[PDB]
Amino acid sequence: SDRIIQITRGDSTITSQDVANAVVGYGVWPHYLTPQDATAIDKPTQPDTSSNRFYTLDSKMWNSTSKGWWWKLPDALKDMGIFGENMFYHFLGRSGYTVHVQCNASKFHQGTLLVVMIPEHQLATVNKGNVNAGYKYTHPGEAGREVGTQVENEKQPSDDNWLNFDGTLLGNLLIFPHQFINLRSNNSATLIVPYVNAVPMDSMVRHNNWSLVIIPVCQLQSNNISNIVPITVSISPMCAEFSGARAKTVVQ
Amino acid sequence: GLPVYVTPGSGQFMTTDDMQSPCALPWYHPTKEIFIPGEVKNLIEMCQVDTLIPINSTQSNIGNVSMYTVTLSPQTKLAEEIFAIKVDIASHPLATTLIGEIASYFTHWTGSLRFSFMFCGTANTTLKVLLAYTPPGIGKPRSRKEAMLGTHVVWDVGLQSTVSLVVPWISASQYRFTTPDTYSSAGYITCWYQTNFVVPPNTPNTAEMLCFVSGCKDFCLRMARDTDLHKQTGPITQ
Amino acid sequence: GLPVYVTPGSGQFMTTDDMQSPCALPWYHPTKEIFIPGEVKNLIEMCQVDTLIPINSTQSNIGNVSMYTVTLSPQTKLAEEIFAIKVDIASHPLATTLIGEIASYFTHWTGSLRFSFMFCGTANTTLKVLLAYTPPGIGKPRSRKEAMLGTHVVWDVGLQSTVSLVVPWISASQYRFTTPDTYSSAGYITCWYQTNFVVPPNTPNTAEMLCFVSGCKDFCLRMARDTDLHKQTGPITQ
Amino acid sequence: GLPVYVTPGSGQFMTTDDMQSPCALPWYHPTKEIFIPGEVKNLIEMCQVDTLIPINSTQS
Amino acid sequence: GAQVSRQSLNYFNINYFKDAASSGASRLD
Amino acid sequence: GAQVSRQSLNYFNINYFKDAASSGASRLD
Amino acid sequence: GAQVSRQSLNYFNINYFKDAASSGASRLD
Amino acid sequence: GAQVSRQSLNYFNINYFKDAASSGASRLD
Amino acid sequence: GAQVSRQSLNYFNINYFKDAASSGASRLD
Amino acid sequence: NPVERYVDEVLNEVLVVPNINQSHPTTSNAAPVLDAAETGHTNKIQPEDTIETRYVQSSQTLDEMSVESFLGRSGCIHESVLDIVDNYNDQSFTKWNINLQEMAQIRRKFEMFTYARFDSEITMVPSVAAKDGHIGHIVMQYMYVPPGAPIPTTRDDYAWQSGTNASVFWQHGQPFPRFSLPFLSIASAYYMFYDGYDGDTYKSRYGTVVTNDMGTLCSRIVTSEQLHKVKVVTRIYHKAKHTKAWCPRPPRAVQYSHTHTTNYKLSSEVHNDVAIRPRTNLTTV
Amino acid sequence: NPVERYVDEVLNEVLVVPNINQSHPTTSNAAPVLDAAETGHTNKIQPEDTIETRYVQSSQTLDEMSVESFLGRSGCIHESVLDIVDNYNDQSFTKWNINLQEMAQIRRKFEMFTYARFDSEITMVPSVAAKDGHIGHIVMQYMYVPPGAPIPTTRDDYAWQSGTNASVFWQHGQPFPRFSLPFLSIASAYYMFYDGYDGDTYKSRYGTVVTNDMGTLCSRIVTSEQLHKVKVVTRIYHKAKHTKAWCPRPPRAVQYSHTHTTNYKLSSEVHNDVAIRPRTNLTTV
Amino acid sequence: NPVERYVDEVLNEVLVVPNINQSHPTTSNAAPVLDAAETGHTNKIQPEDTIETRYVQSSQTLDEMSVESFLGRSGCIHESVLDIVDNYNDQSFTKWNINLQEMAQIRRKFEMFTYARFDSEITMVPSVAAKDGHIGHIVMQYMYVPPGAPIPTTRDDYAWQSGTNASVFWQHGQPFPRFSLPFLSIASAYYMFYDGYDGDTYKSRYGTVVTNDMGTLCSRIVTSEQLHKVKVVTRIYHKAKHTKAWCPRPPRAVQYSHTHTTNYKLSSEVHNDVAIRPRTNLTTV
Ligand SMILES: Cc1cc(CCCOc2c(C)cc(-c3noc(C(F)(F)F)n3)cc2C)on1
Ligand SMILES: Cc1cc(CCCOc2c(C)cc(-c3noc(C(F)(F)F)n3)cc2C)on1
Ligand SMILES: Cc1cc(CCCOc2c(C)cc(-c3noc(C(F)(F)F)n3)cc2C)on1
Ligand SMILES: [Zn+2]
Ligand SMILES: [Zn+2]
Ligand SMILES: [Zn+2]
């Protein structure tokens, strides 16, 4: 059946009996860095199955007024087992990902989530001159950011979902790898993205390569609103490799 | 030396010329190029990707996600009109879509357009709708019967959430102007209730619909020009 | 004559252009070239030669040979820090070394650096020291344990007076800026007592150490630029 | 560079000259040409067609 | 971009720019 | 520095300066 | 438009414009 | 004064003046 | 008017005008 | 054929679009018009599938829509001003922190991609305004000071010697200066966007300002002080050559406010801040 | 022979006219001189048929009478004026709705055909009049704004950046600017005449104004305000290259009055409105 | 292949750097990291010997670091001034004792070698400052007077005839003058340094002034006296072509003070006289 999917990564296996196929960002499957493209000369460390496994973040609650949510990678996994440990003990990291978003309701519920993976999602600030989004705000961790909640601070990012938090129109996010979770059709979304950057490896601490954005474009409605409908995110690194070992970096 | 005749145009600077010039950094060797996923070689690649139409961009909706959805519901009158817009790739509300934005960087366009619609209601919500394209030389249809006489698709809502209506290139001339010009206005897309929006008891009485657009294999843009969909009214400072 | 189109750039004088020009001394025959030892064909040749690092260039030492030596001696506390500097080839105190000076004539650099140390104490003086390279993305190590976790060499003083620590090219980008720029700061080299400085009786209780630097087979400079390690604030007269 | 001698006439604009010039619309592809009846290639074609003489063109 | 002929009378029909619009007056018939 | 072709239609792709950056717009695809 | 000769002494009689009137002084006899 | 090469990629190393001093920057190694 | 040589080092001794007086300095011996 | 390809270049018929084939009435349980946008893919249905089409030979070409063409047109990126008002020594020279972020037109086009790699063609258009009547003999010097090189602080600073930096001298009356630049980054491509910092603290910088340092463009009127004051405005034009772009993105929908940042401003009535024109209602064309 | 054809081009002997052959006295019931103009055909009788002719070798050529030649001469189509009178900001830039209908000489020639397809060569002749004495350093910018592109509304409008539109910068003292344009229509040929409208109501527009929109030519003096005021007049010249024309028609017989329309005016004495000169009577040569 | 070498020139990939090969853990009594700097040799240890490296294909080239490239950029070596103040005959001409020692930037680079042999490219940038308003028609004459040739002592000296010396005439408005010079020394290479004298007494001269005589560069405004006074400053630029250098040496560490001599000055606080920045202590990065 083309409605079913099983994804096995390391010691984790995820399933969904109502998928809308899967997406491979830019049609490129994640792969390890080759010697022709590499620049750093020390032998890389490749944790393999101890890092290339599904890590489930904190679930979020989707309700009639939700404006959306976003996470940044690898920030979101900074505290996830071996993968997390590796991004702080090394100067350089490189990884692809399998992002599996989960959301089920009932055949009597309706709602639609636009699930997007944006490369270099450089956030903007609003009406604050040339002051940019503070490091703290673009590094929320597994908790991510809940659009429409944060009590404004000067260095706080734009919270306008219709402007992609960056001065561009929401309707055009579809140009990035994406899927929709239309409650009437599927209960999950699956996106597999390769490493994308202008350099072969980079600092996992100060550079977030991908941003996962989830915006409810079609409002959640049903005649049984008391039943909470969560949204859960499970991300698995792929071909994770690190270089430039040393002491563990401590942020803040 | 070799006798030469300096021709008109010499010494001029045309922003679109294609000449060679000495390199200011002789001997400099550029950084090795590495593989990066997602390379684009031609803008047509971007025109072929669906993007949402802010079709419901009424003043009260602009600035909200709702400007992208159209609401459907049980009707009391038959064959009611649902929406109506011009087909012109660079007119409003198509203007800010990716294909509309790119079209706004050119003066001419041609080819067939692909409009898609995804029903956002519950799995138990049924509906039949008629999507029609009215070729030019006549006003927009005032009724379903009037619209139905043109190019159309009857969409039945079911397991497959999305339907597509192709607006074939039906024009006197091989190309049309992208800017709103009478002579080259391409027609309309209207949507009507074919049957009705029906639901079982205890099911929401309204549902949303998302609208997409992209170009077909024959879509093409011509004559590069600056866009009027973006401006600068002051200095951009550091 | 042959019709020509004078292109933009014509008549301009670009200090880095590469054109031909008539010779002011026609028929002149240059002096025969004779063999002279020591010809250099590429600056890389000079970058591969060790030169001393004025590593101990404190205000009180500058202007004295002592600015080139680091003093070692018997410690009362274990694993004490000996010295610490940035690895950046054009930062201080590496700036005035030959490779640092040459690097200052270019905008970009890449490759592995070779740091060497020669123990200047007596033949009966023993010592074990730990030389470490801390890749970027973290502050300089605050202890030997912290430093030891990175790239390092444990140096045992013996018959061979000199040891070398290679700072491998570990960077996100293929090149870095030679000028002190945050994004491209390459890390640190720290030196710590592995065991201790030990001597027999009647032997000087301190000893000097000389520090050298040069580039490895992969060192390379790019984008020629004027140096800021030298200036002219007035006319140079006869 | 190649030594050249700028000849008289250079830089001038003669309305009947026949030179080449850079195209302001690079990469632009003109509309396909279709068959249209009645093409004329030389004015002699028009000179060979009878037309009436206003031979009786008195003021009145 | 030269349509070099031969006969020796070697014709050199040169197109200096890469656009057809750029060339001079057309040939006849 | 000329990539002389032949067919007679002899193409002459000339690079006047010794740097790749110096040449004009690239070819397509 | 070149009347290329050979002998090597290769003569290059070039006519820059497409009109006979445009060329320089004539040859003798 | 041209050092015409071939490969077709025909290199044309031209020396416009009759003095070695007149030519541009030298080749490497 | 070119005395094209060959060796490949192709010499191009060109006389731009049709008068001997017009050419540059003479060769030696 | 290197010659057949040549003809396609002259005619601009390198990238042709496919023809429309004749189609016929159909009755089948294969429904191309139906699909699922949830998949994230675009339905690949063509006109022959939804109507009965005729056969048509396409003559359109996609050449002009190529990236090389889209980003290969010279646009203004800076307007340098040297205005002699009351002190020749202080006003006859200036400097500019180089960037492709100050002018909206070319900035928006590059920003329709995440990464771009290209060589550059810079063309300068200097114009001398005669404030008092004459302009004398104006000679300009433009010097590229890469990051690290000494920046002149007076019109006679030794740095103007340009012993290593590239300088271009232009003489009024001569054609517009122009030169090429090779891909300059220390990375494989220029970052149009950068979701990263130059550190990990609340005070670290964010955005492309961290990765796009290009140095300084210093300029001065070489000519020494003259009786009549002039105002020289040099406009810099940039064009990309031999271009490659990656990961297309949504076009800038609101006005730019600053360089190297996506920041923007919103008024109390947001419909005024975007190109979207308010519709009377869903059915008013 | 591509070389034999070359000689014909240089000598202008590509299209030769036929010879006259010797003819003789005739007596026959075949009467070439008699025919019927009602048929709508022209009697194809030649001189050898009506008189006894000698043999003559024709040397005339029809080359110069070719369409390429007839429409291939550069003529003035516009005279743009920038006259600095009392406000530099308002008077230093202008715009023109492009058309080939403002100057009678070239307009009449094109209008001798119904449809025409050709590339264009535009040549500009700018001339700076020194109203107060000096002209300083004059630099001009001409920008082609295709229909839809933003039209500048001030001398510093962002549109002047020309990030995509083609612009030509000319510097006083340099040769006259010139460039080529490819056939621009969305149709297969330009309409010299169009018996149609842009709608079907009493208020729809009639004529070529409906089909011949070519955009706007915007121009400005790049040089900033100078002490002495100047008046720059840029005359635009157009020439057709690689031309084709269809369906010849009667030449314009009265003066033109407006663009894109065949409208005309008549006085009380119409013989004054046409080139026809009144004859004294039928027999006064 | 003379054509394969051509491609390397265009791409600047003539001198490639070696790759880094994968290395492995080792345990041996062969210790590459240990050596003896006393030998005067540099330890040739590479990264593969001190850590476990991966395999990496190098793409860097040493082309730009070549001597030809390092000394092949045109830099200013002299700024000649002709300032008409109150006596045209005395102020309209001047002379310069030629040398490459007056400007620090190019001097320091040449002085990084003991001997250098090269041809020269001289480029001149003249600029006429209108002190009173107009500049009229300025024509300049630059004449190279080799050592021994008569030096003009008035603006009309017979020496200006230049019957044998090379002279370059420049006309204001024309492009910048430029010419090449062949290696000029009576020796096989130029002395960048010379530890010798021109005699053996306490009064003999020391240094390169003894070996580097290059003659005099004389110049004058050819144009005869004009009403309005001008100030012509001609800046001379030099570049080495076809270069060879021998015996590299330490870079100049303090400011230059005079020509042909290594003399220098020291203040009471020497750290101010060198580029070395005082360190807080041994462990403060
Ligand atoms: C991304 C990205 C890419 C770039 C490069 C922009 C080009 O910037 C310049 C310009 C405009 C001029 C020079 C320059 N080089 O020489 C001269 C001189 F002639 F003006 F001196 N100007 C150098 C750079 C890097 O900036 N951001
Ligand atoms: C029928 C028919 C055909 C035409 C085309 C007339 C040519 O009109 C122009 C002109 C005169 C100039 C430009 C132009 N393109 O670039 C420039 C710049 F350099 F002036 F900017 N001017 C563009 C068109 C379409 O008009 N009517
Ligand atoms: C070491 C070393 C090498 C040199 C040569 C420096 C070049 O000096 C010149 C210059 C700058 C110009 C001329 C010159 N020849 O002709 C002219 C003229 F055109 F100016 F007359 N100038 C001749 C020399 C030797 O100086 N020191
Ligand atoms: Zn004046
Ligand atoms: Zn005046
Ligand atoms: Zn005056």
mmCIF file of N, CA, C and O in Angstrom, chain A residues 20 23 72 119-120 122-125 127 129 131-134 138 158 160 167 179-180 182 185 197-198 206 208, chain J residues 38-40 114-115 188 191 194-197 199 206 247-250 252-253 258 260-266:
data_model
loop_
_atom_site.group_PDB
_atom_site.id
_atom_site.type_symbol
_atom_site.label_atom_id
_atom_site.label_comp_id
_atom_site.label_asym_id
_atom_site.label_seq_id
_atom_site.Cartn_x
_atom_site.Cartn_y
_atom_site.Cartn_z
ATOM 1 N N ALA A 20 1.372 10.810 2.655
ATOM 2 C CA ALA A 20 1.134 11.454 1.376
ATOM 3 C C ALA A 20 2.472 11.330 0.680
ATOM 4 O O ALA A 20 3.079 12.322 0.284
ATOM 5 N N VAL A 23 9.045 13.205 0.734
ATOM 6 C CA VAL A 23 9.795 14.162 -0.064
ATOM 7 C C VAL A 23 11.291 14.098 0.202
ATOM 8 O O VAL A 23 11.723 13.995 1.348
ATOM 9 N N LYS A 72 14.828 24.955 14.523
ATOM 10 C CA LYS A 72 15.997 25.117 13.684
ATOM 11 C C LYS A 72 16.933 23.947 13.932
ATOM 12 O O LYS A 72 17.052 23.468 15.058
ATOM 13 N N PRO A 119 16.151 26.195 3.820
ATOM 14 C CA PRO A 119 17.602 26.273 4.005
ATOM 15 C C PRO A 119 17.943 27.744 4.273
ATOM 16 O O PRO A 119 17.357 28.634 3.658
ATOM 17 N N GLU A 120 18.872 27.994 5.193
ATOM 18 C CA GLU A 120 19.270 29.360 5.538
ATOM 19 C C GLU A 120 18.054 30.260 5.775
ATOM 20 O O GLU A 120 17.878 31.267 5.085
ATOM 21 N N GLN A 122 17.032 32.916 7.358
ATOM 22 C CA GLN A 122 17.518 34.067 8.109
ATOM 23 C C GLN A 122 16.356 34.944 8.562
ATOM 24 O O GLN A 122 15.808 35.713 7.775
ATOM 25 N N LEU A 123 15.997 34.829 9.839
ATOM 26 C CA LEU A 123 14.881 35.581 10.407
ATOM 27 C C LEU A 123 15.073 37.084 10.442
ATOM 28 O O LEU A 123 16.194 37.591 10.474
ATOM 29 N N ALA A 124 13.951 37.789 10.451
ATOM 30 C CA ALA A 124 13.955 39.239 10.483
ATOM 31 C C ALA A 124 13.351 39.753 11.781
ATOM 32 O O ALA A 124 12.780 38.989 12.559
ATOM 33 N N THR A 125 13.513 41.051 12.018
ATOM 34 C CA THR A 125 12.924 41.702 13.181
ATOM 35 C C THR A 125 11.988 42.728 12.556
ATOM 36 O O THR A 125 12.145 43.081 11.385
ATOM 37 N N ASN A 127 10.177 46.561 12.673
ATOM 38 C CA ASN A 127 10.188 47.923 13.186
ATOM 39 C C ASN A 127 11.248 48.124 14.259
ATOM 40 O O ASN A 127 10.995 48.781 15.266
ATOM 41 N N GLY A 129 14.740 48.830 13.273
ATOM 42 C CA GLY A 129 15.944 49.272 12.597
ATOM 43 C C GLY A 129 16.837 48.119 12.203
ATOM 44 O O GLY A 129 16.351 47.079 11.772
ATOM 45 N N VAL A 131 18.563 46.163 14.131
ATOM 46 C CA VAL A 131 18.798 45.216 15.217
ATOM 47 C C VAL A 131 18.299 43.857 14.736
ATOM 48 O O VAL A 131 17.159 43.739 14.296
ATOM 49 N N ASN A 132 19.141 42.833 14.816
ATOM 50 C CA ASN A 132 18.738 41.513 14.353
ATOM 51 C C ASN A 132 18.347 40.542 15.448
ATOM 52 O O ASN A 132 18.573 40.797 16.626
ATOM 53 N N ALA A 133 17.760 39.420 15.038
ATOM 54 C CA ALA A 133 17.322 38.382 15.963
ATOM 55 C C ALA A 133 18.495 37.870 16.800
ATOM 56 O O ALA A 133 19.524 37.455 16.260
ATOM 57 N N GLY A 134 18.327 37.898 18.121
ATOM 58 C CA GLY A 134 19.380 37.452 19.019
ATOM 59 C C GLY A 134 19.638 35.959 18.996
ATOM 60 O O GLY A 134 18.718 35.168 18.792
ATOM 61 N N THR A 138 17.052 32.376 18.296
ATOM 62 C CA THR A 138 17.066 31.472 17.160
ATOM 63 C C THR A 138 17.700 30.153 17.565
ATOM 64 O O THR A 138 18.084 29.350 16.719
ATOM 65 N N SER A 158 10.728 38.250 14.107
ATOM 66 C CA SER A 158 9.398 38.532 13.582
ATOM 67 C C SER A 158 8.507 37.332 13.879
ATOM 68 O O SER A 158 8.947 36.183 13.812
ATOM 69 N N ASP A 160 5.374 37.122 12.355
ATOM 70 C CA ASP A 160 4.358 37.186 11.306
ATOM 71 C C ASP A 160 4.412 35.951 10.413
ATOM 72 O O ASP A 160 5.275 35.851 9.545
ATOM 73 N N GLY A 167 10.027 38.584 5.705
ATOM 74 C CA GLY A 167 9.725 39.538 4.650
ATOM 75 C C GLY A 167 9.292 38.969 3.305
ATOM 76 O O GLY A 167 9.337 39.675 2.294
ATOM 77 N N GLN A 179 5.461 19.557 2.451
ATOM 78 C CA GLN A 179 4.324 18.648 2.397
ATOM 79 C C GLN A 179 3.210 19.315 3.189
ATOM 80 O O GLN A 179 3.430 20.318 3.868
ATOM 81 N N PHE A 180 2.009 18.770 3.081
ATOM 82 C CA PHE A 180 0.865 19.289 3.815
ATOM 83 C C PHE A 180 0.332 18.119 4.631
ATOM 84 O O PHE A 180 0.434 16.961 4.215
ATOM 85 N N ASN A 182 -3.038 17.262 5.648
ATOM 86 C CA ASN A 182 -4.441 17.596 5.498
ATOM 87 C C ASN A 182 -5.160 16.473 6.245
ATOM 88 O O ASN A 182 -5.216 15.340 5.770
ATOM 89 N N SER A 185 -6.724 13.562 4.663
ATOM 90 C CA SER A 185 -5.911 12.690 3.814
ATOM 91 C C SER A 185 -4.757 11.941 4.472
ATOM 92 O O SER A 185 -4.525 10.766 4.179
ATOM 93 N N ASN A 197 24.760 23.670 2.080
ATOM 94 C CA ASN A 197 25.554 24.778 2.595
ATOM 95 C C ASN A 197 26.580 25.153 1.522
ATOM 96 O O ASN A 197 26.805 24.384 0.583
ATOM 97 N N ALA A 198 27.196 26.327 1.659
ATOM 98 C CA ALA A 198 28.205 26.789 0.704
ATOM 99 C C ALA A 198 29.610 26.305 1.093
ATOM 100 O O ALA A 198 30.594 26.620 0.419
ATOM 101 N N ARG A 206 26.980 27.701 15.824
ATOM 102 C CA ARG A 206 26.588 29.015 15.361
ATOM 103 C C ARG A 206 25.944 29.116 13.992
ATOM 104 O O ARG A 206 25.676 30.215 13.515
ATOM 105 N N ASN A 208 22.642 27.432 11.851
ATOM 106 C CA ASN A 208 21.503 26.527 11.697
ATOM 107 C C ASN A 208 21.240 26.416 10.199
ATOM 108 O O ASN A 208 20.797 27.371 9.565
ATOM 109 N N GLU J 38 -0.781 17.318 -0.946
ATOM 110 C CA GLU J 38 -0.162 17.024 0.340
ATOM 111 C C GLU J 38 1.205 16.400 0.134
ATOM 112 O O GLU J 38 2.111 16.594 0.941
ATOM 113 N N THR J 39 1.353 15.653 -0.953
ATOM 114 C CA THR J 39 2.615 14.996 -1.251
ATOM 115 C C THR J 39 3.750 15.997 -1.375
ATOM 116 O O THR J 39 4.910 15.648 -1.189
ATOM 117 N N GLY J 40 3.411 17.242 -1.691
ATOM 118 C CA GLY J 40 4.431 18.264 -1.842
ATOM 119 C C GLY J 40 4.931 18.343 -3.273
ATOM 120 O O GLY J 40 5.852 19.098 -3.572
ATOM 121 N N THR J 114 19.246 31.058 -2.633
ATOM 122 C CA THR J 114 19.905 31.002 -1.337
ATOM 123 C C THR J 114 21.414 31.178 -1.468
ATOM 124 O O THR J 114 22.044 31.844 -0.647
ATOM 125 N N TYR J 115 21.988 30.575 -2.505
ATOM 126 C CA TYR J 115 23.421 30.655 -2.752
ATOM 127 C C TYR J 115 23.645 30.975 -4.227
ATOM 128 O O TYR J 115 22.887 30.524 -5.089
ATOM 129 N N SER J 188 32.471 28.153 -1.349
ATOM 130 C CA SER J 188 32.202 27.745 -2.728
ATOM 131 C C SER J 188 31.175 28.592 -3.443
ATOM 132 O O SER J 188 31.081 28.553 -4.669
ATOM 133 N N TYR J 191 26.763 33.623 0.017
ATOM 134 C CA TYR J 191 25.550 33.374 0.790
ATOM 135 C C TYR J 191 24.591 34.524 0.502
ATOM 136 O O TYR J 191 24.949 35.686 0.711
ATOM 137 N N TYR J 194 21.996 33.771 5.392
ATOM 138 C CA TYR J 194 22.814 33.016 6.329
ATOM 139 C C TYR J 194 22.182 32.984 7.717
ATOM 140 O O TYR J 194 22.208 33.975 8.446
ATOM 141 N N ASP J 195 21.612 31.843 8.083
ATOM 142 C CA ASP J 195 20.988 31.707 9.389
ATOM 143 C C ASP J 195 22.044 31.283 10.409
ATOM 144 O O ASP J 195 21.993 30.186 10.972
ATOM 145 N N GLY J 196 23.009 32.169 10.631
ATOM 146 C CA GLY J 196 24.081 31.887 11.567
ATOM 147 C C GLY J 196 24.682 33.145 12.158
ATOM 148 O O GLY J 196 24.346 34.261 11.750
ATOM 149 N N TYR J 197 25.576 32.961 13.124
ATOM 150 C CA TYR J 197 26.223 34.074 13.801
ATOM 151 C C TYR J 197 27.735 33.948 13.744
ATOM 152 O O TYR J 197 28.265 32.971 13.226
ATOM 153 N N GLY J 199 29.428 34.036 16.518
ATOM 154 C CA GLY J 199 29.701 33.680 17.900
ATOM 155 C C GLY J 199 28.505 32.967 18.506
ATOM 156 O O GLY J 199 27.597 32.567 17.780
ATOM 157 N N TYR J 206 24.303 38.542 13.522
ATOM 158 C CA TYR J 206 23.472 37.590 12.797
ATOM 159 C C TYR J 206 23.345 37.964 11.332
ATOM 160 O O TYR J 206 23.332 39.145 10.989
ATOM 161 N N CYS J 247 18.884 26.591 -4.637
ATOM 162 C CA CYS J 247 17.760 26.706 -3.716
ATOM 163 C C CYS J 247 16.947 27.986 -3.845
ATOM 164 O O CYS J 247 17.092 28.909 -3.034
ATOM 165 N N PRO J 248 16.059 28.052 -4.852
ATOM 166 C CA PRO J 248 15.227 29.241 -5.064
ATOM 167 C C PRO J 248 14.340 29.517 -3.861
ATOM 168 O O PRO J 248 13.966 28.595 -3.134
ATOM 169 N N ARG J 249 14.008 30.786 -3.654
ATOM 170 C CA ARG J 249 13.162 31.159 -2.532
ATOM 171 C C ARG J 249 12.132 32.247 -2.852
ATOM 172 O O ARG J 249 12.176 32.861 -3.916
ATOM 173 N N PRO J 250 11.169 32.473 -1.941
ATOM 174 C CA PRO J 250 10.133 33.490 -2.142
ATOM 175 C C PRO J 250 10.735 34.870 -2.386
ATOM 176 O O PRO J 250 11.706 35.250 -1.743
ATOM 177 N N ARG J 252 11.266 38.950 -2.288
ATOM 178 C CA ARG J 252 11.075 39.945 -1.236
ATOM 179 C C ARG J 252 9.680 40.543 -1.441
ATOM 180 O O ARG J 252 9.383 41.070 -2.514
ATOM 181 N N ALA J 253 8.825 40.460 -0.421
ATOM 182 C CA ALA J 253 7.455 40.967 -0.513
ATOM 183 C C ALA J 253 7.224 42.356 0.085
ATOM 184 O O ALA J 253 6.171 42.953 -0.131
ATOM 185 N N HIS J 258 17.369 47.621 5.666
ATOM 186 C CA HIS J 258 18.803 47.663 5.934
ATOM 187 C C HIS J 258 19.597 46.603 5.186
ATOM 188 O O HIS J 258 19.030 45.665 4.630
ATOM 189 N N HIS J 260 22.289 43.468 4.601
ATOM 190 C CA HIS J 260 22.617 42.189 5.222
ATOM 191 C C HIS J 260 21.563 41.641 6.179
ATOM 192 O O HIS J 260 21.825 40.697 6.916
ATOM 193 N N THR J 261 20.372 42.220 6.176
ATOM 194 C CA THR J 261 19.337 41.734 7.067
ATOM 195 C C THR J 261 17.982 41.717 6.391
ATOM 196 O O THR J 261 17.694 42.554 5.538
ATOM 197 N N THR J 262 17.154 40.757 6.785
ATOM 198 C CA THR J 262 15.824 40.613 6.218
ATOM 199 C C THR J 262 14.793 41.439 6.974
ATOM 200 O O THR J 262 13.603 41.364 6.675
ATOM 201 N N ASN J 263 15.249 42.228 7.945
ATOM 202 C CA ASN J 263 14.345 43.064 8.732
ATOM 203 C C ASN J 263 13.426 43.896 7.839
ATOM 204 O O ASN J 263 13.777 44.243 6.708
ATOM 205 N N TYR J 264 12.244 44.212 8.353
ATOM 206 C CA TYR J 264 11.281 45.004 7.603
ATOM 207 C C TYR J 264 10.390 45.775 8.559
ATOM 208 O O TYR J 264 10.422 45.552 9.767
ATOM 209 N N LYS J 265 9.595 46.688 8.021
ATOM 210 C CA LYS J 265 8.693 47.453 8.859
ATOM 211 C C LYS J 265 7.258 47.281 8.393
ATOM 212 O O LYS J 265 7.005 47.067 7.215
ATOM 213 N N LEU J 266 6.326 47.340 9.335
ATOM 214 C CA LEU J 266 4.909 47.202 9.031
ATOM 215 C C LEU J 266 4.153 48.398 9.556
ATOM 216 O O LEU J 266 4.434 48.873 10.649
#
